[PDB]
Design a protein around this ligand. Structure first.
Ligand code: HEM
Ligand code: HEM
Ligand SMILES: Cc1cc(N)nc2cc(-c3ccc(OCC4CCC4)c(CN)c3)ccc12
Ligand SMILES: Cc1cc(N)nc2cc(-c3ccc(OCC4CCC4)c(CN)c3)ccc12
Ligand SMILES: C[C@H](O)[C@H](O)[C@H]1CNc2nc(N)[nH]c(=O)c2N1
Ligand SMILES: C[C@H](O)[C@H](O)[C@H]1CNc2nc(N)[nH]c(=O)c2N1
Ligand SMILES: [Cl-]
Ligand SMILES: [Cl-]
Ligand SMILES: [Gd]
Ligand SMILES: [Gd]
Ligand SMILES: [Zn+2]
Lengths: 402, 403
């Protein structure tokens, strides 16, 4: 019943008793494992609400009586009459933290208790969303001493439309095509760029044009919103010893802020609830800049390093990738912008695992996403067996609104 | 309603229909994935497994549903009646060994699966003769450094008689000598087999690269100790193309990776002694065997020697040191004219395998966490490929240590 979990570096054994509480079934069967897939393929609302409420009161040592009893009644009554319910603000804070804590693919969860919840539930229009987003970006960026923050927009209700940010992140670099179909800019953002132009925006020259937000309030078409250039903090990339690296003209923005996932708490669904923290350097250095389907700079940095690109056994890919990562770490530190290396981040995740073992009896973690995209077996997470499963509250993916 | 499989570098989409034929069950449920576990773990059932293998063999030679095919089925059912088991024909054993390689989810080398030399040792009768078959395996597979993939298959498990077992996890391994202050001299992964050897009467060395003897078990016999001839075991001194102090580390590795403690299963028959060999991918030596903290653990020493800043992680001293350790493995093996494949070439040929396999069987069992190399994962094309992991037979299986 209770999976045995071993660390092959130490020899230590634990048992995931928290896996037993799993719910919204994942994609694996005893016949075949789909753990590597990126996407796993009125009287129930109340049951998910009762469950979430009992979570809250256990956490504050307050299961069994007073306002525990009482709060269970008012949601019962509220859904009985309205067919929905509103979360108390401290609950919305509690649900936000737990959803971060339950995110299997996030290696940064050692921070799950330090999160700033901006309550935008009284939001009413698209111009209002933009003002909230700017308070978020400003507070979250904090002149480069970055601070985790989420902003929660109104919980979708039936009969009325949906609050949805159209961009996948708040800061995204446009991607423009060519006679060759080939992109200038970031190829992951080709679709949202062509939608931005097809909505008034005026495409620019270069690789690092910060996209305009496409914000949409219920039953309205999206609305463009240009971002304040002083509010989009960016870091130009230099290398500590390769003097020519700066002249490649590479940049990356400071604030990773994901604005297209659905926050679910106690049976309510928040289609627009952008959250942000701070980068892990391999995300910028390895995936965004070196993926063949992203900026794909790997061969260009290898030529500058006079590496031999004619045979793979010179490990020229590995030498260039490491140095790109060094340049990210150096440039962010020189700019006083919070960043963390994959070694520090993974070592803290191990510490998170131990904390969460004694607290909740285990921790849902997705091995293929915790292990860094470079130097995997040199970080402790590589040697650590992990159990993956869905708990609530949770962040979920959701179809794009078109 | 079979898994949809996506490649994210390119956009390809496939459906793994082969996974519907998965002849057993693994550790995952809809409630929780346990893919990262290292060990995921009756005449009528022997008959239904054998019937399935005979059906495979006769498909592969384009004789399905033929007279020869029905005759063979009746033969097997009759021999399970008279004796409780059956014997494979020679050609069936060759095909079954190739399919077990082909079916192994954690092997990135399977582009090669059809080039396998199968040594039939099912007439073996003692440990001494076991030793002879094994020396011949090592000699043919090493081939003076132009490595050849081979399997030697010893007699199947059968009732009434104990098993042939190779006690060593590989045919070539280095001793690990326990010490005080509790440290290990040599390979710490082999501390246990090293003691068994000494307690079964082996005079130990005291180096870090001392080749272990073989502990070989005939049925209902105690294991017997055999020293490999030094000149049968090809080895590679490690040096680095530009860091000349590297050679002064005194590091070595052996040419032939020959796994000897797994069970080969075909048509319900079990072969607990069937060692098999190919050639190394450089990351197994460079990253795992040499840089794992619980193996030779040379990362920090290399980094200090490189004058890297080991006081802070953000210099990426570990990454830089490990890359050069891999360069040195590749450089040394190529200098010595010993076959070796780097993680880039290996993973690219696995991508071609996946395409070969999709067209041929409608999919391919693959374990993403083991296929993706331990350095530079997303620099390789397998990182961006979704995979479906499942168990087909014939198969290589883990089996418990005989002590
Ligand atoms: C504070 C520093 C943080 C770091 C270093 C960090 C790091 C990461 C990384 C590396 C990923 C992998 C995604 C990818 O590689 O594509 C990830 C995913 C994710 N993170 Fe974190 N993150 C941080 C903060 C946060 C915050 C503040 C939240 C929510 C409030 C959060 C929730 C998530 C979620 C939901 C995912 C999606 C993965 C899933 O499906 O579970 N993270 N994070
Ligand atoms: C010819 C070159 C070959 C290469 C480069 C290769 C490569 C690899 C690598 C890198 C691993 C994973 C080990 C690790 O990373 O810890 C592996 C596993 C494995 N390989 Fe290969 N291999 C080769 C030949 C063979 C042969 C000849 C056989 C059997 C006849 C074989 C069967 C296996 C099996 C059974 C596993 C374990 C799979 C599992 O537990 O699911 N390989 N291989
Ligand atoms: C708060 C935060 C901080 C940080 N440092 N990193 C973060 C990374 C993600 C993230 C989650 C899922 C993702 O993938 C979804 C696939 C569908 C299209 C890609 C990706 C990009 N792969 C990023 C989300 C939040 C992050
Ligand atoms: C023919 C061959 C060639 C090659 N180049 N490599 C090979 C690697 C393995 C192999 C199998 C299982 C392993 O581990 C199993 C866990 C249980 C105890 C460890 C490991 C080491 N990870 C390697 C087996 C055969 C290989
Ligand atoms: C196919 C494969 O699962 C996919 O490329 C995953 C692998 N692991 C990952 N891990 C992280 N952190 N981010 C990713 O985008 C991916 N991609
Ligand atoms: C616990 C963890 O899954 C384990 O160490 C695995 C991960 N992936 C691996 N992948 C390969 N190829 N070889 C290994 O030894 C491992 N180890
Ligand atoms: Cl990003
Ligand atoms: Cl090995
Ligand atoms: Gd130059
Ligand atoms: Gd030198
Ligand atoms: Zn699974």
């Amino acid at each position: 019943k209770f999976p045995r979990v071993k660390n092959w570096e130490v020899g230590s054994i634990t048992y995931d008793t928290l896996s037993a509480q799993a719910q919204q079934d994942g994609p694996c069967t005893p016949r075949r494992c789909l753990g590597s897939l990126v996407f796993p393929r009125p009287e129930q609302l109340l049951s998910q609400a009762r469950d979430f409420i009992n979570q809250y009161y256990s956490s504050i040592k307050r299961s069994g009586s007073q306002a525990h009893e009482q709060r269970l009644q008012e949601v019962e009554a509220e859904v009985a009459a309205t067919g929905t319910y509103q979360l108390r603000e401290s609950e919305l804070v509690f649900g936000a933290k737990q959803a971060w804590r339950n995110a299997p693919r996030c290696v940064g969860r050692i921070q799950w208790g330090k999160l700033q919840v901006f309550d935008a539930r009284d939001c009413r229009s698209a111009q209002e969303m933009f003002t909230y987003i700017c308070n978020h970006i400003k507070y979250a960026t904090n002149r480069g001493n970055l601070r985790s923050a989420i902003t929660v927009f109104p919980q979708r209700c039936p009969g009325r439309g949906d609050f949805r940010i159209w961009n996948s992140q708040l800061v995204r670099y446009a991607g423009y095509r060519q006679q060759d179909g080939s992109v200038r800019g970031d190829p992951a953002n080709v679709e949202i760029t062509e939608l931005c132009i097809q909505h008034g925006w005026t495409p620019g020259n270069g690789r690092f044009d910060v996209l305009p937000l496409l914000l949409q309030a219920p039953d309205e078409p999206p609305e463009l919103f240009l971002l304040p250039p002083e509010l989009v903090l960016e870091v130009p990339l230099e290398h500590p010893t390769l003097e020519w690296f700066a002249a490649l003209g590479l940049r990356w923005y400071a604030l990773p802020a994901v604005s297209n996932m659905l926050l679910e708490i106690g049976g309510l669904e928040f289609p627009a609830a952008p959250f942000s923290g701070w980068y892990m350097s391999t995300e910028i250095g390895t995936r965004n800049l070196c993926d063949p389907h992203r900026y794909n700079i790997l061969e260009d940095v290898a030529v500058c390093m006079d590496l031999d690109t004619r045979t793979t056994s010179s490990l020229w890919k590995d030498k260039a990738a490491v140095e790109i990562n060094v340049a990210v770490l150096h440039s962010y530190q020189l700019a006083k912008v919070t960043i963390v290396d994959h070694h520090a981040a993974t070592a803290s995740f191990m510490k998170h695992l131990e904390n969460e073992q004694k607290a909740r009896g285990g921790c849902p973690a997705d091995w293929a996403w915790i292990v860094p995209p470079i130097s995997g077996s040199l970080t402790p997470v590589f040697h650590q067996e992990m159990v993956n499963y869905f708990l609530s509250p949770a962040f979920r993916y959701q179809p794009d609104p078109w």
